[PDB]
Amino acid sequence: ADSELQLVEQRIRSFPDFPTPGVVFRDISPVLKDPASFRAAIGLLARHLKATHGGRIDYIAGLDSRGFLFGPSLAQELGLGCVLIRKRGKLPGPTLWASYSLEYGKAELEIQKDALEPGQRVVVVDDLLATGGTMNAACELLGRLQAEVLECVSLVELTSLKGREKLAPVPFFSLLQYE
Amino acid sequence: DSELQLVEQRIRSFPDFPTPGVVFRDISPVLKDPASFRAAIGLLARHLKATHGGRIDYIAGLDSRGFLFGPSLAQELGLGCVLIRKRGKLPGPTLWASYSLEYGKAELEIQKDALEPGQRVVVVDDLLATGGTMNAACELLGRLQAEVLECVSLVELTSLKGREKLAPVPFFSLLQYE
Ligand SMILES: Nc1ncnc2c1ncn2[C@@H]1O[C@H](COP(=O)(O)O)[C@@H](O)[C@H]1O
Numbered sequence: 001a002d003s004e005l006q007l008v009e010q011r012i013r014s015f016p017d018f019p020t021p022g023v024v025f026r027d028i029s030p031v032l033k034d035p036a037s038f039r040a041a042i043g044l045l046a047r048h049l050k051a052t053h054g055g056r057i058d059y060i061a062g063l064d065s066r067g068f069l070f071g072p073s074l075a076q077e078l079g080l081g082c083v084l085i086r087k088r089g090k091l092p093g094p095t096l097w098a099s100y101s102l103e104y105g106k107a108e109l110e111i112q113k114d115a116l117e118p119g120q121r122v123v124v125v126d127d128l129l130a131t132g133g134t135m136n137a138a139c140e141l142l143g144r145l146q147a148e149v150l151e152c153v154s155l156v157e158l159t160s161l162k163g164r165e166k167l168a169p170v171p172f173f174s175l176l177q178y179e
Numbered sequence: 180d181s182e183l184q185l186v187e188q189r190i191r192s193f194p195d196f197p198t199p200g201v202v203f204r205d206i207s208p209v210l211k212d213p214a215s216f217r218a219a220i221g222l223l224a225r226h227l228k229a230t231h232g233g234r235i236d237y238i239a240g241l242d243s244r245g246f247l248f249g250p251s252l253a254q255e256l257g258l259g260c261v262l263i264r265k266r267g268k269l270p271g272p273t274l275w276a277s278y279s280l281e282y283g284k285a286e287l288e289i290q291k292d293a294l295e296p297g298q299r300v301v302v303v304d305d306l307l308a309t310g311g312t313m314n315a316a317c318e319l320l321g322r323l324q325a326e327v328l329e330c331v332s333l334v335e336l337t338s339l340k341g342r343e344k345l346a347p348v349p350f351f352s353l354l355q356y357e
């Protein structure tokens with residue numbers, strides 16, 4: 001299978017029972033630490049996105065905090081800027097926020113109101129898709145700026161969690177899948 | 180310097196955020212303008228090569244806004260990026276370090292296996308203010324017996340004497356405000 005995709009897959013480290021028993025934590029750290037693995041990940045994402053959307057993409061939106069690690073590089077590769085979707089309380093100026101369910105409690109994401117103008121087309125990036133709550137909340141916020149979410153993408157997807165279905169009808173793509 | 184102007188023109192200031200008195204320096208417009216972002220990373224990367232040649236082994240990006248620059252800076256330099264995170268995010272054995280942030284305490288963490296003794300690291304974050312965050316990152320790295328060659332940022336608030344706080348570790352910023 002794809003040699004570039006293998007550079008990424010080999011650099012995913014799986015930690016059982018973190019944070020809780022029975023959960024397998026997928027750690028993307030080694031992808032970052034290996035310059036050829038990171039270059040491979042950004043390349044595969046970028047090639048997917050240009051092939052799927054051509055010139056439609058206006059900005060990449062990176063999710064706080066591990067999507068920050070990929071969004072700017074992905075955006076740079078596509079010749080685009082990167083806008084930021086943060087945990088609530090961290091961005092100055094006018095914002096929109098959206099509450100969502102995260103593990104056992106509620107969290108809040110926010111965006112600056114001037115991050116995007118109506119009609120602008122975005123692709124959302126994070127490291128991993130699990131339940132899809134975080135991506136879904138990001139999609140909500142972007143939709144409220146009257147931006148169009150073309151797709152959400154991640155390095156890893158946990159398929160038994162049906163995060164994909166939660167995002168439908170917004171398309172989704174992952175480099176790698178685990179149950 | 181037209182390159183430095185590209186970054187300077189895209190820092191936005193917000194008085195009295197998060198708390199009255201703080202003038203927040205927002206790097207968001209740098210990220211949004213691909214020429215500005217490319218300029219910030221190039222200026223940092225040129226400085227670091229001019230100052231350290233090929234002695235740098237890794238960039239360390241600090242959670243969370245250093246994450247926006249770390250990977251790109253590391254790639255431009257041909258290096259990997261290690262992560263220094265806010266505590267409770269990393270799996271496997273870690274160490275952590277407390278520091279004063281606002282009116283209380285926060286902690287940064289690193290995996291015990293993030294680096295090997297003797298490996299040489301440059302830490303990046305968006306902005307240096309008091310230097311508490313950067314100083315905790317240096318502490319962590321020194322606890323892994325890594326050598327911190329320098330810390331770098333886009334913005335430095337000079338009245339806050341973050342540079343002195345990191346001394347004798349060298350520091351470089353693209354832009355300075357009081
Ligand atoms: N098993 C896992 N391993 C690593 N990160 C995870 C895992 N499950 C969820 N996450 C993180 O939690 C968020 C995804 O949660 P969700 O909103 O359920 O898709 C993302 O920020 C992921 O980085």
Ligand SMILES: Nc1ncnc2c1ncn2[C@@H]1O[C@H](COP(=O)(O)O)[C@@H](O)[C@H]1O
Pocket residue numbers: 201202203204205243244304305306307308309310311312313341
């Ligand atoms: N005026 C400011 N504007 C933007 N970020 C700030 C400001 N002051 C502190 N920070 C953030 O707080 C951390 C630096 O604080 P310090 O630990 O005091 O250097 C960095 O992670 C910065 O991103």
Ligand SMILES: [Cl-]
Pocket residue numbers: 095096097
């Ligand atoms: Cl709101």
